Design a protein around this ligand. Structure first.
Ligand code: HEM
Ligand code: HEM
Ligand code: H4B
Ligand code: H4B
Ligand code: JM6
Ligand code: JM6
Ligand code: ZN
Lengths: 407, 411
């Protein structure tokens, strides 16, 4: 019921007590570990509301004070009569920062408390949403000096009136199926790209076409909007020694902003809550460029480096993977767009884990996601035991809205 | 209950029914996953059900479930258990048993080979000298002048846990580690503790960077004894690089035969506390972990200097660059000297096919993603993209405590 985690590179040993306040379920049993699976009422709402305010008031050292009990009565009162309730600003800010704090898949959490929260609960329309969104994109982009932010749309009510950003990220490239069999652009987005055109988008049909936003306000059909180009900071990708690299004509966007997750604070569900930080290099260079089901450029790059592709044992895919990632980090740096390499991002996360053990009694963490997808064991997180558990408030996955939405 | 695992690269979904046949706990609960945690005397009463379960599996695999030969073996094991408090495996059962322990080994990416495993039965062994002789023959047979062959050697099972056979080495061939007075380590820091023990037991240490350790062998619960493996039986490979001529001058070599000697093999409830087994290396085991862990030979800095990489900012990926060249060199050196080795692309690709075949034919393949995914270039190998279910089948290889921590010394 108290647990040890050990780092096998440093023999440092940490004691987790924070898992005892774990709420949700992992997907694992004593018989079977699912640690590698990607996706593993008035009466319901009150316990949730309670548990949350208890967390809040304890954090500001007013646990069991007049103001505590009072707000607790107030929220019951509201639950009893409205069937939902509304968070104060301070609770909304706390709830969101804590949801990032509890995101066990997130290596970037040393930054958790500096989150800038934009309260968009007064929004009513997709045009409204589009405005909030551009203001978020501009504030977080900050001409390259990126800053954490989240924008929070109104919470669900009857689930017939949901706010949803249909895009999976605010800024992503289109995917088009082609006559020859293959795919132009980004294969991950192929289906959303069909939906845009099927909702009315004129697509330019290139390799790096910034998708339009598809926004659903208050349960209505969603609407199309094009993000002002001047707000999409993009980096052309070159290499500090390979001349011919720029002739692949690769570019990437500077602002990663996940837009399809659900935020749960004290039993309340915020289905549209786009958030953003900045990239660790490997995300683009290893996954976006090199996954077979993504841009998949390893073959071409190795072709230009004149490496021996005649057998796997020359490690040509590995040599190329390195140079590709050198060319992402260098390009972003040369243009001064915040970016972090996997080495210092992981070292920071170790520091963050230590802090969290010391001050909070633990730090939930999902090893499978924290260890970068190249050079794993030469980052310190590889040697670090982690405990994974689900704390609230949290970010949750939710089904792609087109599967749910009724027209 | 059926369980689905998706490969996110290919969209292949597979259905696991095999996890139903599962016994031992995982370490995880519904409230916590311990999937990254490294390590999360038996009564008559509890022995017969285990015996029985195993024999049921056995007779099913040879298509004689419920036969007279099956029923009689049950009854004969039952009777032996009641009368002697333990029981003896037939040869055929032991072979089947050791093979399955390998097939069930969820952290092993090499399992496509499971069915081609040479089992040497050393259950007639009585002494340490007897052990050394068995081990030597294992090393020579498995080495096979560089064309490696997988093999395991099985010493007598535990009885009252006061007469245990153990190999005190963690691998049969491994290199000394020596802590110097200045705090530095000469050789392999993984093996310093065991190296001290050897010296204390009377080993005269050469004290170089690559001294093959002597064997430390315990028979019948007796104090263990030292033996030098004959050097002619120790296949070693100097490491060089196909393009970097200064690479030989780092003075690196490695041994060709990886042979884990500290695990416990469990079959039908019986415990074989000494069962060294060997296969061959995947290149990343040496080139990433053995050479480049900070707590092992730690050569990254030295290789990066010699490459003249920019080491001022980690964002040069000088570490990633050096690491690839080192793994190239390990693969190149082994292939040149005709010693079996496998790269992590080829190994993980093989494992994927093994895994899919295991689902079709067995209804599952327990796998530990944390271990199966290589420690470099994870996502460009297809396992990274493969959902896996981890659960504990028997027969199995288990961890056991280091014997110096448990052994009662005779004097
Ligand atoms: C500030 C710099 C940040 C860095 C460097 C960073 C880094 C990362 C990385 C590398 C991942 C894995 C992503 C993937 O493999 O697709 C991730 C996942 C995640 N991050 Fe962070 N992050 C940052 C900020 C944030 C913020 C501001 C939030 C929320 C406020 C957040 C919440 C999450 C969540 C919920 C996941 C898992 C997402 C999923 O399951 O797809 N991150 N992060
Ligand atoms: C045939 C060639 C083989 C290859 C390429 C192979 C590959 C590997 C690799 C790379 C590992 C991870 C090792 C580490 O990180 O230290 C491993 C683990 C393991 N393998 Fe295999 N293996 C082979 C043969 C065998 C055999 C013959 C057995 C038993 C009969 C076996 C049983 C295991 C076990 C029990 C583990 C986990 C060890 C631990 O928990 O420390 N392997 N294997
Ligand atoms: C099957 C496996 O769970 C899947 O490939 C995971 C592995 N680790 C990951 N880690 C990160 N950071 N992001 C990912 O998308 C994934 N994918
Ligand atoms: C904490 C963590 O589980 C530990 O570093 C594991 C990670 N994955 C591994 N994977 C393999 N194959 N071998 C190892 O020794 C390890 N070490
Ligand atoms: C967006 S919030 C998490 C912090 C931002 C980030 N660094 N990445 C997360 C998802 C982006 C995805 N891996 C990609 O390569 O586009
Ligand atoms: C003996 S069991 C598996 C067959 C041999 C093997 N391929 N790996 C075992 C572990 C070797 C260790 N990782 C090392 O680098 O020495
Ligand atoms: Zn688990």
């Amino acid at each position: 019921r108290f647990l040890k985690v050990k780092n096998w590179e440093t023999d440092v040993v940490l004691t987790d007590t924070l898992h005892l306040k774990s709420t949700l379920e992992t997907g694992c049993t004593e018989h079977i570990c699912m640690g590698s699976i990607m996706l593993p009422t008035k009466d319901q709402l009150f316990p949730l509301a309670k548990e949350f305010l208890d967390q809040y008031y304890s954090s500001i050292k007013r646990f069991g004070s007049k103001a505590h009990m009072d707000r607790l009565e107030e929220v019951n009162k509201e639950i009893e009569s409205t069937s939902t309730y509304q968070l104060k600003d301070t609770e909304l800010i706390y709830g969101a920062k804590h949801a990032w704090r509890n995101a066990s898949r997130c290596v970037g959490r040393i930054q958790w408390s500096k989150l800038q929260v934009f309260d968009a609960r007064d929004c009513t329309t997709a045009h409204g949403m589009f405005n909030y969104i551009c203001n978020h994109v501009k504030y977080a982009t900050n001409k390259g000096n990126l800053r954490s932010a989240i924008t929070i749309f109104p919470q669900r009510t009857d689930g017939k009136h949901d706010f949803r950003v249909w895009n999976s990220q605010l800024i992503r490239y289109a995917g088009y199926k082609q006559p020859d069999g293959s795919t132009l652009g980004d294969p991950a987005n192929v289906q959303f790209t069909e939906i845009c055109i099927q909702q009315g988008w004129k697509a330019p049909r290139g390799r790096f076409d910034v998708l339009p936003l598809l926004l659903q306000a208050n349960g209505n059909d969603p609407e199309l909007f094009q993000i002002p180009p001047e707000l999409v900071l993009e980096v052309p990708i070159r290499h500090p020694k390979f001349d011919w690299f720029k002739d692949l004509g690769l570019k990437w966007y500077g602002l990663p902003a996940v837009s399809n997750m659900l935020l749960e604070i004290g039993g309340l569900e915020f289905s549209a809550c786009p958030f953003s930080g900045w990239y660790m290099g490997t995300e683009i260079g290893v996954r976006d460029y090199c996954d077979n089901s993504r841009y998949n450029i390893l073959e071409e790059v190795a072709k230009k480096m004149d490496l021996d592709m005649r057998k796997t044992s020359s490690l040509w895919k590995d040599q190329a993977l390195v140079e590709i990632n050198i060319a992402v980090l260098y390009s972003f740096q040369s243009d001064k767009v915040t970016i972090v390499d996997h080495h210092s991002a992981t070292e920071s996360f170790i520091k963050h884990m230590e802090n969290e053990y010391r001050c909070r009694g633990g730090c939930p963490a999902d090893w499978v996601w924290i260890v970068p997808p190249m050079s794993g064991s030469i980052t310190p997180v590889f040697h670090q035991e982690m405990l994974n558990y689900r704390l609230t408030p949290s970010f949750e996955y939710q089904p792609d809205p087109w599967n749910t939405h009724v027209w």
